[PDB]
Amino acid sequence: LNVNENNILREKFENYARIVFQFNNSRQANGNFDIANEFISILSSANGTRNAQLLESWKILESMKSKDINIVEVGKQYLEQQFLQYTDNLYKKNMNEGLATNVNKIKSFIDTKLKKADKSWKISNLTVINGVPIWALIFYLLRAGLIKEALQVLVENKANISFLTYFKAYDPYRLAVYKLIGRCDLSRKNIPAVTLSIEDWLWMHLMLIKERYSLEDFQNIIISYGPSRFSNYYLQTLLLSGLYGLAIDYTYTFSEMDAVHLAIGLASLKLRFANILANYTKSFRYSDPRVAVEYLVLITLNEGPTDVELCHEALRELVLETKEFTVLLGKIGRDGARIPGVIEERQPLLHVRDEKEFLHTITEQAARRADEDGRIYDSILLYQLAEEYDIVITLVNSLLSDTLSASDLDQPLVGPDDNSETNPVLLARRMASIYFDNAGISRQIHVKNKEICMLLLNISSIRELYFNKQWQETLSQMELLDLLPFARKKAQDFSNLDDNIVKNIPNLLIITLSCISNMIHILNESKYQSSTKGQQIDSLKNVARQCMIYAGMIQYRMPRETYSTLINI
Ligand SMILES: [Cl-]
């Protein structure tokens, strides 16, 4: 199965996921939720053989919630209720009413199912009174769960006739009633003339159970005959007999998705689950990591210490293999506070040993994995969530330093599409503004790292000035850097510069020298009237001259290629 194979299957996935979503919400708010009711709602509008079969299975589960656990009593209750409802629909069709007594809905039923049209009884040897078959009536009252009424009918006709003595304690139809009430002749479980449907058969057996006829015996018979002999009522049969594992199996044969969700239903009723959910996750795990988390969180539906470990393990393998860190593990907001990911939202349901250490451990681990894989952006994101502030600055300083030295001066550092997640300049600005102005966080950062970062930000500002041809403002910003000789002293210090700064100096010199060439040209124009024209030129030529000697002393510590474009300027 693959939930993304087509749009017909994809929609069903979304509808079911929303249900599971609301279920986790109830579990967590410790509130009221009726999952069976939910699917019943979604399936009642569906159409087909299997869908009609699934809709009824959910009704079976629904009619079973919050009830004393008793497979046989619950199967009887269900089948009896269902027959009653069935006789209702028949009355509301034949007599078009809806307000007749139970007893009358049933005589109306008995009357239209035991006559050949001929006003001739279809089954010979019926004991009759006032034109109505007392044992047939008595049987279908039982069959409807209406023991009070069945007893009344027996009492009334007492005389036209002490099985009645035993009945109070507890023709073919007369044979059935004695057999069911007496629970006699168990060797002959079947009395077919009065069995007109599969529902009737299952109910007959359930009646008979625990001279000795056990549920396990009933189940054996069912399994023995297999799906072959239950037409389109095998799932119901499986659930009614309490063969829950086999019900799921069977549902897998025509619909993996419905099987998963039926299993969620039985589980929520407390009756390979982790594996059922982990497997169903496989196809939408990468395209919908939030839905994956929702289904895996169901694993703790059972509170055993064993399957809580299965849940954490599955969640670990989700984050490691999908690397949807932001969604799963969260992200840091501009106030410095973590904005929870999906796993942190469902943490109550996770039954963790330590609220804070569970996510921290996964995060720290994924972090060491990211910097070993060379995933720089992942690393930065993860070390933020780890609150490893200093490592974050170090990694940003490298990333930003590398972007500056490797980009061309002619090309803008930052486009209109760029964001703090993908652009090193934008990213670094975001980190500075979240961490440097936050005293609690800044103290955790090494003053030198913070220095380098500010420098790299200043340099990125200088770069945008330079690109927009703001020569003079570039120069005065360049001068505040305290890096270039506005000489010999600083070339000697060149060896003590941070490794991140030194790869930026060659471009700094090319910007500096090129702003000077441009200003000088502007100052030489005729239109340029200033009384200090000449002292400005000279002063610019001084800076250029000192950068040149500086440049020459450090010439083999930048590519010849750049030292050459710098000399020829
Ligand atoms: Cl640069």
mmCIF file with all atom_site columns, C-alpha atoms in Angstrom, residues 251-444:
data_model
loop_
_atom_site.group_PDB
_atom_site.id
_atom_site.type_symbol
_atom_site.label_atom_id
_atom_site.label_alt_id
_atom_site.label_comp_id
_atom_site.label_asym_id
_atom_site.label_entity_id
_atom_site.label_seq_id
_atom_site.pdbx_PDB_ins_code
_atom_site.Cartn_x
_atom_site.Cartn_y
_atom_site.Cartn_z
_atom_site.occupancy
_atom_site.B_iso_or_equiv
_atom_site.pdbx_formal_charge
_atom_site.auth_seq_id
_atom_site.auth_comp_id
_atom_site.auth_asym_id
_atom_site.auth_atom_id
_atom_site.pdbx_PDB_model_num
ATOM 1   C CA . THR A 1 251 ? -9.529  -6.933 6.768  1.00 0.00 ? 251 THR A CA 1
ATOM 2   C CA . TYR A 1 252 ? -5.920  -6.746 5.536  1.00 0.00 ? 252 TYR A CA 1
ATOM 3   C CA . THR A 1 253 ? -6.921  -8.958 2.595  1.00 0.00 ? 253 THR A CA 1
ATOM 4   C CA . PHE A 1 254 ? -9.081  -6.218 1.041  1.00 0.00 ? 254 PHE A CA 1
ATOM 5   C CA . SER A 1 255 ? -7.913  -2.951 2.643  1.00 0.00 ? 255 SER A CA 1
ATOM 6   C CA . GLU A 1 256 ? -4.776  -2.311 4.674  1.00 0.00 ? 256 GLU A CA 1
ATOM 7   C CA . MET A 1 257 ? -5.965  1.145  5.671  1.00 0.00 ? 257 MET A CA 1
ATOM 8   C CA . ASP A 1 258 ? -9.203  -0.039 7.221  1.00 0.00 ? 258 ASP A CA 1
ATOM 9   C CA . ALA A 1 259 ? -7.353  -2.872 8.961  1.00 0.00 ? 259 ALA A CA 1
ATOM 10  C CA . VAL A 1 260 ? -4.990  -0.387 10.646 1.00 0.00 ? 260 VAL A CA 1
ATOM 11  C CA . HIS A 1 261 ? -7.932  1.640  11.893 1.00 0.00 ? 261 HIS A CA 1
ATOM 12  C CA . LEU A 1 262 ? -10.013 -1.318 13.003 1.00 0.00 ? 262 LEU A CA 1
ATOM 13  C CA . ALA A 1 263 ? -6.962  -2.337 15.010 1.00 0.00 ? 263 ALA A CA 1
ATOM 14  C CA . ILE A 1 264 ? -6.825  1.146  16.516 1.00 0.00 ? 264 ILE A CA 1
ATOM 15  C CA . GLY A 1 265 ? -10.465 0.632  17.512 1.00 0.00 ? 265 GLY A CA 1
ATOM 16  C CA . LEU A 1 266 ? -10.008 -2.769 19.183 1.00 0.00 ? 266 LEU A CA 1
ATOM 17  C CA . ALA A 1 267 ? -6.922  -1.440 20.973 1.00 0.00 ? 267 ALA A CA 1
ATOM 18  C CA . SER A 1 268 ? -8.779  1.551  22.321 1.00 0.00 ? 268 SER A CA 1
ATOM 19  C CA . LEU A 1 269 ? -11.203 -1.081 23.645 1.00 0.00 ? 269 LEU A CA 1
ATOM 20  C CA . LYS A 1 270 ? -8.402  -3.068 25.260 1.00 0.00 ? 270 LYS A CA 1
ATOM 21  C CA . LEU A 1 271 ? -8.629  -6.220 23.144 1.00 0.00 ? 271 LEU A CA 1
ATOM 22  C CA . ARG A 1 272 ? 1.893   -6.467 16.836 1.00 0.00 ? 272 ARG A CA 1
ATOM 23  C CA . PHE A 1 273 ? -0.008  -3.211 17.312 1.00 0.00 ? 273 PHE A CA 1
ATOM 24  C CA . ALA A 1 274 ? 3.198   -1.157 17.363 1.00 0.00 ? 274 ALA A CA 1
ATOM 25  C CA . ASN A 1 275 ? 4.173   -3.021 14.226 1.00 0.00 ? 275 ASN A CA 1
ATOM 26  C CA . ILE A 1 276 ? 0.769   -2.469 12.587 1.00 0.00 ? 276 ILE A CA 1
ATOM 27  C CA . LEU A 1 277 ? 1.231   1.306  13.065 1.00 0.00 ? 277 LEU A CA 1
ATOM 28  C CA . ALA A 1 278 ? 4.944   1.468  12.178 1.00 0.00 ? 278 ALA A CA 1
ATOM 29  C CA . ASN A 1 279 ? 4.162   -0.335 8.908  1.00 0.00 ? 279 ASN A CA 1
ATOM 30  C CA . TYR A 1 280 ? 1.172   1.808  7.953  1.00 0.00 ? 280 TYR A CA 1
ATOM 31  C CA . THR A 1 281 ? 3.505   4.769  8.457  1.00 0.00 ? 281 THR A CA 1
ATOM 32  C CA . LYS A 1 282 ? 6.039   3.629  5.831  1.00 0.00 ? 282 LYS A CA 1
ATOM 33  C CA . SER A 1 283 ? 4.322   5.263  2.822  1.00 0.00 ? 283 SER A CA 1
ATOM 34  C CA . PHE A 1 284 ? 3.489   8.749  4.237  1.00 0.00 ? 284 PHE A CA 1
ATOM 35  C CA . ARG A 1 285 ? 6.425   8.970  6.628  1.00 0.00 ? 285 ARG A CA 1
ATOM 36  C CA . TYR A 1 286 ? 8.467   11.359 4.428  1.00 0.00 ? 286 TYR A CA 1
ATOM 37  C CA . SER A 1 287 ? 5.644   13.339 2.857  1.00 0.00 ? 287 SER A CA 1
ATOM 38  C CA . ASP A 1 288 ? 3.751   13.734 6.132  1.00 0.00 ? 288 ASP A CA 1
ATOM 39  C CA . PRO A 1 289 ? 6.039   13.487 9.185  1.00 0.00 ? 289 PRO A CA 1
ATOM 40  C CA . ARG A 1 290 ? 3.308   15.072 11.368 1.00 0.00 ? 290 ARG A CA 1
ATOM 41  C CA . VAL A 1 291 ? 0.822   12.334 10.492 1.00 0.00 ? 291 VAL A CA 1
ATOM 42  C CA . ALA A 1 292 ? 3.493   9.724  11.160 1.00 0.00 ? 292 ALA A CA 1
ATOM 43  C CA . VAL A 1 293 ? 3.940   11.114 14.687 1.00 0.00 ? 293 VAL A CA 1
ATOM 44  C CA . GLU A 1 294 ? 0.201   10.926 15.245 1.00 0.00 ? 294 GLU A CA 1
ATOM 45  C CA . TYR A 1 295 ? -0.004  7.197  14.469 1.00 0.00 ? 295 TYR A CA 1
ATOM 46  C CA . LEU A 1 296 ? 3.140   6.262  16.386 1.00 0.00 ? 296 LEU A CA 1
ATOM 47  C CA . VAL A 1 297 ? 1.786   8.074  19.417 1.00 0.00 ? 297 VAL A CA 1
ATOM 48  C CA . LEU A 1 298 ? -1.068  5.559  19.357 1.00 0.00 ? 298 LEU A CA 1
ATOM 49  C CA . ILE A 1 299 ? 1.499   2.903  20.291 1.00 0.00 ? 299 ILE A CA 1
ATOM 50  C CA . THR A 1 300 ? 1.270   3.970  23.959 1.00 0.00 ? 300 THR A CA 1
ATOM 51  C CA . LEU A 1 301 ? -2.443  3.206  23.773 1.00 0.00 ? 301 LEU A CA 1
ATOM 52  C CA . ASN A 1 302 ? -1.186  0.238  25.736 1.00 0.00 ? 302 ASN A CA 1
ATOM 53  C CA . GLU A 1 303 ? 0.728   1.390  28.813 1.00 0.00 ? 303 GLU A CA 1
ATOM 54  C CA . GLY A 1 304 ? 3.108   -1.577 29.034 1.00 0.00 ? 304 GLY A CA 1
ATOM 55  C CA . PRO A 1 305 ? 6.762   -0.645 29.619 1.00 0.00 ? 305 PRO A CA 1
ATOM 56  C CA . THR A 1 306 ? 7.657   -2.738 26.571 1.00 0.00 ? 306 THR A CA 1
ATOM 57  C CA . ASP A 1 307 ? 5.633   -0.838 23.955 1.00 0.00 ? 307 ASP A CA 1
ATOM 58  C CA . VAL A 1 308 ? 6.495   2.580  25.367 1.00 0.00 ? 308 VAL A CA 1
ATOM 59  C CA . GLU A 1 309 ? 10.052  1.702  24.332 1.00 0.00 ? 309 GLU A CA 1
ATOM 60  C CA . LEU A 1 310 ? 8.709   0.652  20.947 1.00 0.00 ? 310 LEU A CA 1
ATOM 61  C CA . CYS A 1 311 ? 7.133   4.124  20.630 1.00 0.00 ? 311 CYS A CA 1
ATOM 62  C CA . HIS A 1 312 ? 10.279  6.071  21.477 1.00 0.00 ? 312 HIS A CA 1
ATOM 63  C CA . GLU A 1 313 ? 12.357  3.841  19.195 1.00 0.00 ? 313 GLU A CA 1
ATOM 64  C CA . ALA A 1 314 ? 9.945   4.428  16.353 1.00 0.00 ? 314 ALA A CA 1
ATOM 65  C CA . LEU A 1 315 ? 10.008  8.173  16.944 1.00 0.00 ? 315 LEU A CA 1
ATOM 66  C CA . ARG A 1 316 ? 13.783  8.207  17.071 1.00 0.00 ? 316 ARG A CA 1
ATOM 67  C CA . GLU A 1 317 ? 13.845  6.393  13.715 1.00 0.00 ? 317 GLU A CA 1
ATOM 68  C CA . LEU A 1 318 ? 11.352  8.881  12.338 1.00 0.00 ? 318 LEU A CA 1
ATOM 69  C CA . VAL A 1 319 ? 13.524  11.936 13.061 1.00 0.00 ? 319 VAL A CA 1
ATOM 70  C CA . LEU A 1 320 ? 16.821  10.255 12.132 1.00 0.00 ? 320 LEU A CA 1
ATOM 71  C CA . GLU A 1 321 ? 15.545  8.959  8.784  1.00 0.00 ? 321 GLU A CA 1
ATOM 72  C CA . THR A 1 322 ? 13.332  11.898 7.732  1.00 0.00 ? 322 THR A CA 1
ATOM 73  C CA . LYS A 1 323 ? 15.404  14.705 9.272  1.00 0.00 ? 323 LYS A CA 1
ATOM 74  C CA . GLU A 1 324 ? 12.298  16.871 9.419  1.00 0.00 ? 324 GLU A CA 1
ATOM 75  C CA . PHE A 1 325 ? 13.862  18.543 12.407 1.00 0.00 ? 325 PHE A CA 1
ATOM 76  C CA . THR A 1 326 ? 11.908  21.787 12.433 1.00 0.00 ? 326 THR A CA 1
ATOM 77  C CA . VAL A 1 327 ? 8.520   20.001 12.299 1.00 0.00 ? 327 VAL A CA 1
ATOM 78  C CA . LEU A 1 328 ? 9.494   17.165 14.711 1.00 0.00 ? 328 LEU A CA 1
ATOM 79  C CA . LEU A 1 329 ? 11.902  18.847 17.155 1.00 0.00 ? 329 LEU A CA 1
ATOM 80  C CA . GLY A 1 330 ? 10.731  22.438 16.919 1.00 0.00 ? 330 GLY A CA 1
ATOM 81  C CA . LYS A 1 331 ? 12.480  25.700 16.226 1.00 0.00 ? 331 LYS A CA 1
ATOM 82  C CA . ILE A 1 332 ? 13.662  28.809 18.108 1.00 0.00 ? 332 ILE A CA 1
ATOM 83  C CA . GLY A 1 333 ? 11.625  32.023 17.984 1.00 0.00 ? 333 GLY A CA 1
ATOM 84  C CA . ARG A 1 334 ? 12.877  35.632 18.025 1.00 0.00 ? 334 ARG A CA 1
ATOM 85  C CA . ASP A 1 335 ? 12.364  35.794 21.808 1.00 0.00 ? 335 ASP A CA 1
ATOM 86  C CA . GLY A 1 336 ? 14.799  32.935 22.294 1.00 0.00 ? 336 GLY A CA 1
ATOM 87  C CA . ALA A 1 337 ? 12.085  30.490 23.321 1.00 0.00 ? 337 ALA A CA 1
ATOM 88  C CA . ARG A 1 338 ? 11.638  27.142 21.643 1.00 0.00 ? 338 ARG A CA 1
ATOM 89  C CA . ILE A 1 339 ? 8.513   26.774 19.548 1.00 0.00 ? 339 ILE A CA 1
ATOM 90  C CA . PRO A 1 340 ? 7.543   23.115 20.193 1.00 0.00 ? 340 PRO A CA 1
ATOM 91  C CA . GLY A 1 341 ? 7.622   20.590 17.370 1.00 0.00 ? 341 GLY A CA 1
ATOM 92  C CA . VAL A 1 342 ? 4.992   17.897 16.929 1.00 0.00 ? 342 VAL A CA 1
ATOM 93  C CA . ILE A 1 343 ? 6.658   15.373 19.230 1.00 0.00 ? 343 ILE A CA 1
ATOM 94  C CA . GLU A 1 344 ? 6.819   17.868 22.086 1.00 0.00 ? 344 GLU A CA 1
ATOM 95  C CA . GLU A 1 345 ? 3.107   18.590 21.671 1.00 0.00 ? 345 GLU A CA 1
ATOM 96  C CA . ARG A 1 346 ? 2.237   14.889 22.178 1.00 0.00 ? 346 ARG A CA 1
ATOM 97  C CA . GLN A 1 347 ? 4.719   14.445 25.037 1.00 0.00 ? 347 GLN A CA 1
ATOM 98  C CA . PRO A 1 348 ? 2.094   13.718 27.709 1.00 0.00 ? 348 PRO A CA 1
ATOM 99  C CA . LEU A 1 349 ? 1.041   10.664 25.643 1.00 0.00 ? 349 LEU A CA 1
ATOM 100 C CA . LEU A 1 350 ? 4.674   9.553  25.372 1.00 0.00 ? 350 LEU A CA 1
ATOM 101 C CA . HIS A 1 351 ? 5.065   8.360  28.967 1.00 0.00 ? 351 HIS A CA 1
ATOM 102 C CA . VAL A 1 352 ? 8.663   9.611  29.116 1.00 0.00 ? 352 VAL A CA 1
ATOM 103 C CA . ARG A 1 353 ? 10.956  9.166  32.123 1.00 0.00 ? 353 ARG A CA 1
ATOM 104 C CA . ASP A 1 354 ? 12.076  12.840 32.118 1.00 0.00 ? 354 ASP A CA 1
ATOM 105 C CA . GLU A 1 355 ? 10.092  15.602 30.410 1.00 0.00 ? 355 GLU A CA 1
ATOM 106 C CA . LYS A 1 356 ? 13.197  17.590 29.512 1.00 0.00 ? 356 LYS A CA 1
ATOM 107 C CA . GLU A 1 357 ? 15.817  14.871 28.918 1.00 0.00 ? 357 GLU A CA 1
ATOM 108 C CA . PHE A 1 358 ? 13.898  12.894 26.239 1.00 0.00 ? 358 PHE A CA 1
ATOM 109 C CA . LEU A 1 359 ? 13.889  15.532 23.494 1.00 0.00 ? 359 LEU A CA 1
ATOM 110 C CA . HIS A 1 360 ? 17.250  16.904 24.577 1.00 0.00 ? 360 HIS A CA 1
ATOM 111 C CA . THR A 1 361 ? 18.893  13.515 24.143 1.00 0.00 ? 361 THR A CA 1
ATOM 112 C CA . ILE A 1 362 ? 17.457  12.938 20.688 1.00 0.00 ? 362 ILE A CA 1
ATOM 113 C CA . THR A 1 363 ? 18.382  16.503 19.681 1.00 0.00 ? 363 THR A CA 1
ATOM 114 C CA . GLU A 1 364 ? 21.961  16.396 20.966 1.00 0.00 ? 364 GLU A CA 1
ATOM 115 C CA . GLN A 1 365 ? 22.416  13.063 19.121 1.00 0.00 ? 365 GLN A CA 1
ATOM 116 C CA . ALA A 1 366 ? 20.985  14.241 15.804 1.00 0.00 ? 366 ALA A CA 1
ATOM 117 C CA . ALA A 1 367 ? 23.358  17.228 16.235 1.00 0.00 ? 367 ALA A CA 1
ATOM 118 C CA . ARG A 1 368 ? 26.558  15.157 16.400 1.00 0.00 ? 368 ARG A CA 1
ATOM 119 C CA . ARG A 1 369 ? 25.229  13.241 13.382 1.00 0.00 ? 369 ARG A CA 1
ATOM 120 C CA . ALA A 1 370 ? 24.648  16.441 11.379 1.00 0.00 ? 370 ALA A CA 1
ATOM 121 C CA . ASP A 1 371 ? 28.120  17.933 11.824 1.00 0.00 ? 371 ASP A CA 1
ATOM 122 C CA . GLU A 1 372 ? 29.668  14.538 11.021 1.00 0.00 ? 372 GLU A CA 1
ATOM 123 C CA . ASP A 1 373 ? 27.544  14.374 7.855  1.00 0.00 ? 373 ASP A CA 1
ATOM 124 C CA . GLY A 1 374 ? 28.586  17.919 6.970  1.00 0.00 ? 374 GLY A CA 1
ATOM 125 C CA . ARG A 1 375 ? 24.961  19.076 7.198  1.00 0.00 ? 375 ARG A CA 1
ATOM 126 C CA . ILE A 1 376 ? 25.780  22.609 8.311  1.00 0.00 ? 376 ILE A CA 1
ATOM 127 C CA . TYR A 1 377 ? 22.269  24.097 8.372  1.00 0.00 ? 377 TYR A CA 1
ATOM 128 C CA . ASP A 1 378 ? 20.923  21.035 10.227 1.00 0.00 ? 378 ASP A CA 1
ATOM 129 C CA . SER A 1 379 ? 23.743  21.350 12.776 1.00 0.00 ? 379 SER A CA 1
ATOM 130 C CA . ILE A 1 380 ? 23.001  25.005 13.462 1.00 0.00 ? 380 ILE A CA 1
ATOM 131 C CA . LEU A 1 381 ? 19.275  24.326 13.882 1.00 0.00 ? 381 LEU A CA 1
ATOM 132 C CA . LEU A 1 382 ? 19.915  21.351 16.217 1.00 0.00 ? 382 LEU A CA 1
ATOM 133 C CA . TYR A 1 383 ? 22.558  23.069 18.358 1.00 0.00 ? 383 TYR A CA 1
ATOM 134 C CA . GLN A 1 384 ? 20.075  25.934 18.821 1.00 0.00 ? 384 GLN A CA 1
ATOM 135 C CA . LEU A 1 385 ? 17.424  23.547 20.165 1.00 0.00 ? 385 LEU A CA 1
ATOM 136 C CA . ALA A 1 386 ? 20.165  22.018 22.336 1.00 0.00 ? 386 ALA A CA 1
ATOM 137 C CA . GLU A 1 387 ? 20.831  25.543 23.640 1.00 0.00 ? 387 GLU A CA 1
ATOM 138 C CA . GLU A 1 388 ? 24.492  25.142 22.704 1.00 0.00 ? 388 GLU A CA 1
ATOM 139 C CA . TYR A 1 389 ? 24.825  28.863 22.046 1.00 0.00 ? 389 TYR A CA 1
ATOM 140 C CA . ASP A 1 390 ? 28.591  29.029 21.609 1.00 0.00 ? 390 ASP A CA 1
ATOM 141 C CA . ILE A 1 391 ? 28.772  26.133 19.131 1.00 0.00 ? 391 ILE A CA 1
ATOM 142 C CA . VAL A 1 392 ? 26.042  27.845 17.109 1.00 0.00 ? 392 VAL A CA 1
ATOM 143 C CA . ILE A 1 393 ? 28.065  31.048 16.850 1.00 0.00 ? 393 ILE A CA 1
ATOM 144 C CA . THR A 1 394 ? 31.168  29.077 15.846 1.00 0.00 ? 394 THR A CA 1
ATOM 145 C CA . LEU A 1 395 ? 29.261  27.246 13.101 1.00 0.00 ? 395 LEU A CA 1
ATOM 146 C CA . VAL A 1 396 ? 27.641  30.474 11.836 1.00 0.00 ? 396 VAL A CA 1
ATOM 147 C CA . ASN A 1 397 ? 31.026  32.217 11.824 1.00 0.00 ? 397 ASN A CA 1
ATOM 148 C CA . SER A 1 398 ? 32.425  29.496 9.588  1.00 0.00 ? 398 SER A CA 1
ATOM 149 C CA . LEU A 1 399 ? 29.393  29.386 7.348  1.00 0.00 ? 399 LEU A CA 1
ATOM 150 C CA . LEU A 1 400 ? 29.242  33.192 6.993  1.00 0.00 ? 400 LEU A CA 1
ATOM 151 C CA . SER A 1 401 ? 33.001  33.586 6.584  1.00 0.00 ? 401 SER A CA 1
ATOM 152 C CA . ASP A 1 402 ? 32.900  30.968 3.789  1.00 0.00 ? 402 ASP A CA 1
ATOM 153 C CA . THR A 1 403 ? 29.974  32.626 1.999  1.00 0.00 ? 403 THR A CA 1
ATOM 154 C CA . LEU A 1 404 ? 31.681  36.031 1.993  1.00 0.00 ? 404 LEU A CA 1
ATOM 155 C CA . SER A 1 405 ? 35.037  34.787 0.666  1.00 0.00 ? 405 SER A CA 1
ATOM 156 C CA . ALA A 1 406 ? 33.499  32.543 -1.999 1.00 0.00 ? 406 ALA A CA 1
ATOM 157 C CA . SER A 1 407 ? 30.844  34.871 -3.427 1.00 0.00 ? 407 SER A CA 1
ATOM 158 C CA . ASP A 1 408 ? 31.791  37.455 -6.051 1.00 0.00 ? 408 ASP A CA 1
ATOM 159 C CA . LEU A 1 409 ? 31.735  41.125 -5.114 1.00 0.00 ? 409 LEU A CA 1
ATOM 160 C CA . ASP A 1 410 ? 29.651  41.841 -8.221 1.00 0.00 ? 410 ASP A CA 1
ATOM 161 C CA . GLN A 1 411 ? 26.808  39.655 -6.989 1.00 0.00 ? 411 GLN A CA 1
ATOM 162 C CA . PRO A 1 412 ? 24.374  40.656 -4.186 1.00 0.00 ? 412 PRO A CA 1
ATOM 163 C CA . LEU A 1 413 ? 24.791  38.720 -0.938 1.00 0.00 ? 413 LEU A CA 1
ATOM 164 C CA . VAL A 1 414 ? 21.031  38.526 -0.430 1.00 0.00 ? 414 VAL A CA 1
ATOM 165 C CA . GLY A 1 415 ? 18.193  38.263 -2.943 1.00 0.00 ? 415 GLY A CA 1
ATOM 166 C CA . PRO A 1 416 ? 14.468  38.986 -2.572 1.00 0.00 ? 416 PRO A CA 1
ATOM 167 C CA . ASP A 1 417 ? 13.737  35.252 -2.127 1.00 0.00 ? 417 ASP A CA 1
ATOM 168 C CA . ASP A 1 418 ? 16.422  34.584 0.495  1.00 0.00 ? 418 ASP A CA 1
ATOM 169 C CA . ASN A 1 419 ? 15.500  33.800 4.109  1.00 0.00 ? 419 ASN A CA 1
ATOM 170 C CA . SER A 1 420 ? 17.094  33.298 7.534  1.00 0.00 ? 420 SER A CA 1
ATOM 171 C CA . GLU A 1 421 ? 16.816  29.530 7.047  1.00 0.00 ? 421 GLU A CA 1
ATOM 172 C CA . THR A 1 422 ? 18.828  29.384 3.843  1.00 0.00 ? 422 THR A CA 1
ATOM 173 C CA . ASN A 1 423 ? 20.916  32.583 3.548  1.00 0.00 ? 423 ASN A CA 1
ATOM 174 C CA . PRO A 1 424 ? 24.058  32.710 5.788  1.00 0.00 ? 424 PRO A CA 1
ATOM 175 C CA . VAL A 1 425 ? 23.902  36.531 6.053  1.00 0.00 ? 425 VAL A CA 1
ATOM 176 C CA . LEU A 1 426 ? 20.213  36.492 7.024  1.00 0.00 ? 426 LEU A CA 1
ATOM 177 C CA . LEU A 1 427 ? 20.813  33.512 9.311  1.00 0.00 ? 427 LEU A CA 1
ATOM 178 C CA . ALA A 1 428 ? 23.685  35.216 11.120 1.00 0.00 ? 428 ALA A CA 1
ATOM 179 C CA . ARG A 1 429 ? 21.661  38.401 11.579 1.00 0.00 ? 429 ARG A CA 1
ATOM 180 C CA . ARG A 1 430 ? 18.873  36.387 13.138 1.00 0.00 ? 430 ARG A CA 1
ATOM 181 C CA . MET A 1 431 ? 21.279  34.651 15.556 1.00 0.00 ? 431 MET A CA 1
ATOM 182 C CA . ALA A 1 432 ? 22.930  37.941 16.546 1.00 0.00 ? 432 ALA A CA 1
ATOM 183 C CA . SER A 1 433 ? 19.569  39.590 17.258 1.00 0.00 ? 433 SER A CA 1
ATOM 184 C CA . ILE A 1 434 ? 18.223  36.636 19.269 1.00 0.00 ? 434 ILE A CA 1
ATOM 185 C CA . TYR A 1 435 ? 21.413  35.944 21.270 1.00 0.00 ? 435 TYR A CA 1
ATOM 186 C CA . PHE A 1 436 ? 23.619  39.049 21.507 1.00 0.00 ? 436 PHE A CA 1
ATOM 187 C CA . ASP A 1 437 ? 20.958  41.309 22.989 1.00 0.00 ? 437 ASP A CA 1
ATOM 188 C CA . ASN A 1 438 ? 19.845  38.616 25.435 1.00 0.00 ? 438 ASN A CA 1
ATOM 189 C CA . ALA A 1 439 ? 22.124  38.873 28.477 1.00 0.00 ? 439 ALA A CA 1
ATOM 190 C CA . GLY A 1 440 ? 21.245  35.387 29.726 1.00 0.00 ? 440 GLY A CA 1
ATOM 191 C CA . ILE A 1 441 ? 22.349  33.815 26.465 1.00 0.00 ? 441 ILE A CA 1
ATOM 192 C CA . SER A 1 442 ? 25.218  36.125 25.498 1.00 0.00 ? 442 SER A CA 1
ATOM 193 C CA . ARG A 1 443 ? 27.191  35.252 28.653 1.00 0.00 ? 443 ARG A CA 1
ATOM 194 C CA . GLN A 1 444 ? 27.221  31.616 27.462 1.00 0.00 ? 444 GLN A CA 1
#
